[PDB]
From Swiss-Prot, chain B:
Disulfide bonds join 8-35, 23-27. It is found in: Secreted. This is Isthmin-1. The C-terminal AMOP domain plays an important role in the anti-angiogenic function of ISM1. The gene is ISM1. The chain holds residues 222 to 464 of 464 of the full protein. It comes from Homo sapiens (Human).
Length: 222, 226
């Protein structure tokens, strides 16, 4: 039978709410929905540490003090990736608590058509994206992509590469900062992923496997 | 309609398959199923030696079981197990770390029990983090100390989100642990006060009681409705 609907996860904002239908033997049905409660963030937060606080080879050899410092702090703020696909993000928009950054972070499903998974992350099956917090230190957004078994793909052509600019701030600025260099360097993930390092904060098992990672490398260098 | 079954989560081990399904607006329905593949080292060794060498309500009947095995085993469980730490061991957020029990004067290994498969939202709705003790090579039982903590990282001694010891750990079996340490708790409709008197939370280090007297009482009238 059914079970309880949980609590609306937040009062001072907008949250999520989950139920455990919990079916029969060796099976467990759950179900999640987002809930609403009342109460100049995207364009007036990073501007405080920027506006006043101030070919493929030439790109990934750029030692800009702005770009370097920003990227450092990006990895010193962004949450980890989930070790598994948060199923409750398929049709809803889910909330995950990063145990390392000790905070709640909001995630939208980035497996849509405008993502074009067959193009950018051709190993993956699903992708998810961090969302600009109300107290976001940056305009960034953790990207994470998963496989057919729903586990995180750590290294390679389809992996969670942090995006300097999120689609919430701008889908075109993101595309021309976090994708335009990736298409310049002909899909060479090994050339891209060293400048834009994927993230495995919760330290999940490495994938694709050692042998299969290498076959990818020798194909991606041609 | 529904969606895919998805692939077994692991081949070199034992995993699951999860299925999503069209829900309502801003909802997401899902369901999980178990999957088995061959490769439980010391689980079926030290325990098996300790096992063989030893107008009516269902929840009442469970809490009315005078099994000499159950009572004897439980006594030695609350003697093998370590005390709960007063605070949250930060370094465990990944998965695992080793801390030292002052009472037992020994090291014990702990795993982070704060995942989504846990659903802290439901089973320990006060708590923010949870951790469980791990089956030591010299463990006398299949049990495991559960301890759940709060926003301020401190142990929640009483109430709906508390460290209720598990007679059977996930390491030995996830299904037998469910059907011994969770199934009666589901039976006794989320009644922590009914459950916890028979499966008593532990505060061996005698940290400050939490939640406070004021809020603990607020929990009384609420939690015995749902
Ligand atoms: C789900 O919730 C309960 C079952 O536990 C009932 O009110 C009803 O069957 C509903 O479908
Ligand atoms: C969830 O389910 C129904 C609403 O659809 C109610 O019984 C109650 O709100 C519960 O929390
Ligand atoms: C459930 O419904 C049908 C299968 O009977 C399909 O549209 C699809 O496979 C979905 O999972
Ligand atoms: C089960 O669900 C459908 C088959 O109807 C597919 O998504 C897949 O083969 C899965 O195992």
């Amino acid at each position: 039978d059914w079970s309880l609907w949980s609590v609306c996860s937040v009062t001072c904002g907008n949250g999520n709410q989950k139920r455990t239908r919990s079916c029969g033997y060796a099976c467990t049905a759950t179900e999640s929905r987002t809930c609403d409660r009342p109460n100049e963030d995207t364009f007036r937060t990073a501007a405080t540490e920027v506006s006043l606080l101030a070919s493929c080879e030439r790109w990934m050899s750029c030692k800009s003090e702005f770009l370097k410092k920003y990227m450092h702090k990006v990895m010193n703020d962004l949450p980890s990736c989930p070790c598994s696909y948060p199923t409750e993000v398929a049709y809803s928009t889910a909330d995950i608590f990063d145990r390392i950054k000790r905070k709640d972070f909001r995630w939208k499903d980035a497996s849509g058509p405008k993502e074009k998974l067959e193009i950018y992350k051709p190993t993956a099956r699903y992708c998810i994206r961090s969302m600009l917090s109300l107290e976001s230190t940056t305009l960034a957004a953790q990207h994470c992509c998963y496989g057919d078994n729903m586990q995180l793909i750590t290294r390679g052509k389809g992996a969670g590469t942090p995006n300097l600019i999120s689609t919430e701030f701008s889908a075109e600025l993101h595309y021309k900062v976090d994708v335009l260099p990736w298409i310049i360097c002909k899909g060479d993930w090994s050339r891209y992923n060293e400048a834009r390092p994927p993230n495995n904060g919760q330290k999940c098992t490495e994938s694709p496997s050692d042998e299969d990672y290498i076959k990818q490398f020798q194909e991606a260098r041609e």
